[PDB]
Structure formats: C-alpha cells, structure tokens
C-alpha cells in the first residue's frame, strides 16, 4: 500500500515487471 510498486523476485526478472500490491 501507498503510491509505490516494489515487486517480488519473480524467478528474477520477467522484463523487470514483477508481482506485488504496492
């Protein structure tokens, strides 16, 4: 939550998207 989007180490690096809520 908050106006951020850190993400998890989804494998490592799917384009430098990753999954998270906030």
UniProtKB/TrEMBL annotation:
Domain of life where this protein originates: Bacteria
Protein name (record): ATP-grasp target RiPP
Organism: Thermobifida fusca (strain YX)
Interval of the full protein contained in this chain: 68 to 89 of 89
């Amino acid at each position: 939550c908050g106006c951020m989007r850190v993400t998890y180490p989804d494998g490592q690096k799917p384009g430098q998207s990753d999954v998270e809520k906030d």
